[PDB]
Design a binder for this molecule. Structure first.
Ligand code: MG
Ligand code: MG
Ligand code: MG
Ligand code: MG
Ligand code: MG
Ligand code: MG
Ligand code: MG
Ligand code: MG
Ligand code: MG
Ligand code: MG
Ligand code: MG
Ligand code: MG
Ligand code: MG
Ligand code: MG
Ligand code: MG
Ligand code: MG
Ligand code: MG
Ligand code: MG
Ligand code: MG
Ligand code: MG
Ligand code: MG
Ligand code: MG
Ligand code: MG
Ligand code: MG
Ligand code: MG
Ligand code: MG
Ligand code: MG
Lengths: 52, 147, 128
RNA sequence: UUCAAGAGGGCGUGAAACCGUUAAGAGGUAAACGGGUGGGGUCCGCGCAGUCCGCCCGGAGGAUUCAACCCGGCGGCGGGU
RNA sequence: CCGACCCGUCUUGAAACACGGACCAAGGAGUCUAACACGUGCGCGAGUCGGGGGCUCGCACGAAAGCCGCCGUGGCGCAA
RNA sequence: AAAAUGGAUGGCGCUGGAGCGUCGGGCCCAUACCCGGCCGUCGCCGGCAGUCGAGAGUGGACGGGAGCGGCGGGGGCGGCGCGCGCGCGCGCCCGCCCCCGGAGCCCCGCGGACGCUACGCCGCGACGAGUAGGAGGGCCGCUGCGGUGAGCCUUGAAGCCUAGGGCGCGGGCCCGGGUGGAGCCGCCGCAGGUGCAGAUCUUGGUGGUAGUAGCAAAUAUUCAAACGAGA
């Protein structure tokens, strides 16, 4: 039921959007895992450039 | 902040702000944008005209990178370069006439909205407009095309 | 003997009783604390004769004497000597009252000093 | 016995409804209620006078340092030729 | 002594021969996200935003804080 | 001109009215009107960071000549105007003409309220019904986080009871006494599973009913002795 002079909108929520939500709470640990992998590779390839 | 709301002020008040003759029942008009032809015809003829129908041709697989032409006017042209340039021109009287690339600073077509001060500038751009080409020659400059 | 305050104007109170809630004489889930009635058929709201009276702002009390004791003094609550010495200069308008949680051995100290500085105490003999 | 059984084996504290007893008071228009007064009890404070306190001036009594003014040191405020 | 019919709710209209209600304690009912419109408050200003990622802290705090040829790939805006 | 429970000028009752009609003086009383006090809101382009007054644009710093006048103008009684100063006083016309680090009583142009938490203090004048509903102020309250009270406490915290003393229009709160046995609160900000009389509400418990209804289908018990506190 609309009213005085707003927008018309079409939101995409008529499915079951709620079993399938995704939290970005593991954002830092994801960063931390990478460094320790990114360091260690460059230690494995010792003098070779780290970038590649 | 719950403590700044108006549910913290309708305690005691029996109906929580929604009447006694008519009540906050579930979905009493429809559910969504239903009824543009039936029993909401008036909101959509009044505040949203052009909604129902169909018009125009169809372009099926449209790529918005082919159609790309960033625009600029003349007033906002001497700001692509620094201040050494515009001042060292009109000076030493050789016919300096500097060069201004627009495709460097992220612009392709040139437009003739404004005016510009009297120095004999040169311009390089892919496209031009009619009036823009005139104003430049009117001040004593030139226009140049590139690929 | 007793410390005289500065002035002692007469005091006048437009109402002396309290305002009880309605239908609290019948029942025990219902209390004496004022809650306003909001029904449609109700007659305290509609103000018939011979019924409960509702509090408005006309019963409001004069401002020269508001929060004023029968002795002319106004009240102030403490917990130690440190916040008592702030009353030295208003020793003829305001009085002191010691909290309920203070120990016996410390009340003696506070009284002993208030008596020096001429700061009246409205409960000088409690625990002993 | 234990500080404590007014902590006694489903024993921390221990509300209300509902009951038993004791103290007071009352009783033929069911009870309860609002405003206004009266009477009686329970407690608070009299004081077993409550005569409240403070400035300056006058009087009679006694008393011991300083200040008034000078000198020495110390500290601070202000100044503008 | 005078006054004075039981509360809630529907209703043009309730003391009702209109429904609910023996009594007490505890629980109990206008929320969270996503998008929009406007009003207010703060900051920068034809510009303004790092939210994704990377450089520094082992993370006691702190899964924070600071920083970036990323410094603008890009989005909203400056032209219909 | 006749109705069904006994029956209503409101009732008792009234006939030189306490009846019917026209009229007088006196009188009674509503939250209305008038006078006053107390509370809140609204309006004053209100007022006060420190000096002038209730009639109509005010103030000094400033040179060459100096007084008896000014202000030689409406039976209008006019903002402008005239006898509470106009040249007063002190030394010797001539001169002085300090003057409030304090004159002298209601304007002091030297700085200031006992008031000045300016989100404050003061003054005037008018108004106040209220459902659904909209807004504001809440030093009304409940649980927890960050800072802060050189906070409270086994010489007794929370909680609970109270013919006790008191405050606020109210929400609610502070003291006093008893019990009890270990933690709790006030201020500035933050946040929320935040305030019940009900919903044939949910869970538990308790009453009147009530020492009541009842312990009635199928023929039937009696006498003595024994164990045993006890039939
Ligand atoms: Mg709208
Ligand atoms: Mg309402
Ligand atoms: Mg509403
Ligand atoms: Mg409703
Ligand atoms: Mg309807
Ligand atoms: Mg009161
Ligand atoms: Mg009604
Ligand atoms: Mg004990
Ligand atoms: Mg115990
Ligand atoms: Mg027990
Ligand atoms: Mg009893
Ligand atoms: Mg209605
Ligand atoms: Mg009907
Ligand atoms: Mg009703
Ligand atoms: Mg009926
Ligand atoms: Mg129904
Ligand atoms: Mg029933
Ligand atoms: Mg509850
Ligand atoms: Mg905005
Ligand atoms: Mg009103
Ligand atoms: Mg313990
Ligand atoms: Mg919570
Ligand atoms: Mg809730
Ligand atoms: Mg309940
Ligand atoms: Mg209710
Ligand atoms: Mg029987
Ligand atoms: Mg039988």
């Amino acid at each position: 039921a609309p009213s005085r002079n707003g927008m018309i909108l079409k939101p995409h929520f008529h499915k079951d959007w709620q079993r399938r939500v995704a939290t970005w709470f593991n954002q830092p640990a994801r960063k931390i895992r990478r460094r320790k992998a990114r360091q260690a590779r460059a230690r494995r390839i010792a003098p070779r450039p780290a970038s590649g | 902040p719950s403590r700044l709301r108006k549910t913290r002020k309708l305690r005691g008040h029996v109906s929580h702000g929604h009447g006694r003759i008519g009540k906050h029942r579930k979905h009493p008009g429809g559910r969504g944008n239903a009824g543009g032809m039936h029993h909401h015809r008036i909101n959509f003829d009044k505040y949203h005209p052009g909604y129902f129908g169909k018009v125009g041709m169809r372009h099926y697989h449209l790529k918005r990178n082919q159609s790309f032409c960033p625009t600029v006017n003349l007033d906002k042209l001497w700001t692509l370069v620094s201040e050494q340039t515009r001042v060292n021109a009109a000076k030493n009287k050789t016919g300096a006439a500097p060069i201004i690339d627009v495709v460097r600073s992220g612009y392709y077509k040139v437009l003739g909205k404004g005016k510009l001060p009297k120095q004999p500038v040169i311009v390089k751009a892919k496209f031009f407009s009619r009036r823009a080409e005139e104003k430049i020659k009117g001040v004593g400059g030139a226009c140049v095309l590139v690929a | 003997a007793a410390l005289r305050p500065l002035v002692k104007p007469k005091i006048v109170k437009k109402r002396t009783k309290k305002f009880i809630r309605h239908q609290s004489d019948r029942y025990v889930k219902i209390k004496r604390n004022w809650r306003k009635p909001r029904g449609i058929d109700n007659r305290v709201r509609r103000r018939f004769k011979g019924q409960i009276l509702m509090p408005n702002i006309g019963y409001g009390s004069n401002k020269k004497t508001k929060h004023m004791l029968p002795s002319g003094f106004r009240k102030f609550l403490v917990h130690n000597v440190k916040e008592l010495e702030v009353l030295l200069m208003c020793n003829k308008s305001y009085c002191a009252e010691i909290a309920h949680n203070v120990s016996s051995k410390n009340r003696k100290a506070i009284v002993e000093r208030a008596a020096q500085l001429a700061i009246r105490v409205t409960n000088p003999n409690a625990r002993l």
